[PDB]
Design a protein around this ligand. Sequence first.
Ligand SMILES: [Ca+2]
Ligand SMILES: [Ca+2]
Lengths: 186, 186
Amino acid sequence: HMALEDKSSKLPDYKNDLLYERTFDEGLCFPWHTCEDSGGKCDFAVVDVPGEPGNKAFRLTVIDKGQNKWSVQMRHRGITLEQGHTYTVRFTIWSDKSCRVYAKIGQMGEPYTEYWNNNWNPFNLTPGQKLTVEQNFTMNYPTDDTCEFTFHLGGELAAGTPYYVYLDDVSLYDPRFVKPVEYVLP
Amino acid sequence: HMALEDKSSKLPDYKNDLLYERTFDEGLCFPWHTCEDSGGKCDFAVVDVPGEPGNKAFRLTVIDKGQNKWSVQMRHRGITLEQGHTYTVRFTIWSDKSCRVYAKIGQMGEPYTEYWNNNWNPFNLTPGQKLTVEQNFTMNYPTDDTCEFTFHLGGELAAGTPYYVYLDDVSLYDPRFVKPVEYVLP
Ligand SMILES: [Ca+2]
Ligand SMILES: [Ca+2]
């Protein structure tokens, strides 16, 4: 189905982004979705950012933290990391409670090799503090088309349930990547 | 419909082409279609080009010449010629009989202004002879979004019916034109 380019002034060119939705400002989040596993429970909506007309954010409700950090996630699959390419990972996240969020890009399936993960450190969210992250890394492993960009929220990362975690302005940029185009008329 | 880019080593860049189908090599022709008018009858199909593995071409069967040159046509609509732009018209045409083909890019409706038309001359097709045309013209009239690239085959142009006219490698290139792109997700 048909995806939506954005022309955000604070992100790199959409055409070189491996992600298909970055700003949620149309109320749409696809291909971003949630996962429940091992007892986790969650919901999602795209919602207005208070004080910032026009601006909307992806909002995950953590309902049950389940049995593991990976019991609750928000993710974007369909990611190939290319040997030799240098990626810029970018995102704004916040929460209405004190919680942790483990961000990673890595294999969807076993053995779940992690290609990026903020050097094994989750991010500490604090109410009233938004975190805008920007990091680079270079894929030194063989090219891997089975990757996802995922945030784990469950288990010992979780605050008291239920609560909200927000994502916005999310980008995985590669200067040597261009999305496949299709042409339409019109 | 979604359109399929080609990367012909003989045509200019697909993204700069006002035409959505140029090589026919997949078995598909859309938006190239036929028209029958004032007595004309015809058919079409995409068929293999004998002796040239993997090459296909649009084939028009002229069934009945009708009353006018315009009674039988093969044509691509959805063409905006823009004032001051310079357009390269390209095409390869041939037939199993001696006939004439009138090629033009002009208005779809009354008054049928013709912006390019090989200086009012139809092309003379002879069996065993393929014609590859390449001409430039600049659009000196005001931009007109009601144009088509049409080939007339009826009336006094026509050979003894039925017979086939073939079209291949068609392109209408403008260096200052870029097709709009949609993004689709693999
Ligand atoms: Ca937003
Ligand atoms: Ca062909």
